[PDB]
Structure 1
Amino acid sequence: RISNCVADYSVLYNSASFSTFKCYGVSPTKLNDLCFTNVYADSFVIRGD
């Protein structure tokens, strides 16, 4: 659970290392102009397809 931070998604997005960046209900580049109550970060590893 991440909260009380200035989430700089613009730096995170423009990195070419990421192979899939798909956002639903929010455009991937306007995220830097919105404020959020709490952001949950889930992480795991799966296969490609």
Structure 2
Amino acid sequence: NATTFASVYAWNRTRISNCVADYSVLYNFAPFFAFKCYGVSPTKLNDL
């Protein structure tokens, strides 16, 4: 929900650790059109 997004050539990098990742909120977003996962099952993110 960041107001400003960085450019493609200057993509911002953030590190997330030592917390619980809630993917239900990620699924709850409506304007999401393209969602591709490689190597893992998208529905198993809450378990892995």
In structure 1, stretches of 5+ residues that fail to align are 35-49
Within 5 Å, give how 1:1-49 maps onto structure 2: 1-34=15-48
> How many residue pairs were aligned?
34
Structure 2-normalised TM-score?
A: 0.57
Q: Counterparts of 1:15 and 1:30 in 2: how far apart (Å)?
A: 18
Q: Percent identity?
A: 88
**Greater RCO (CA < 8 Å, at least 6 residues apart):** 1
Structure 1-normalised TM-score?
A: 0.56
Counterpart contact for 1:10–1:29, Cα < 8 Å: no
> Which consecutive segments of 4 or more residues in structure 1 shift more than 3 A?
none
What is the alpha-carbon root mean square deviation over aligned residues? 1.2
Structure with higher Rg: it is 2
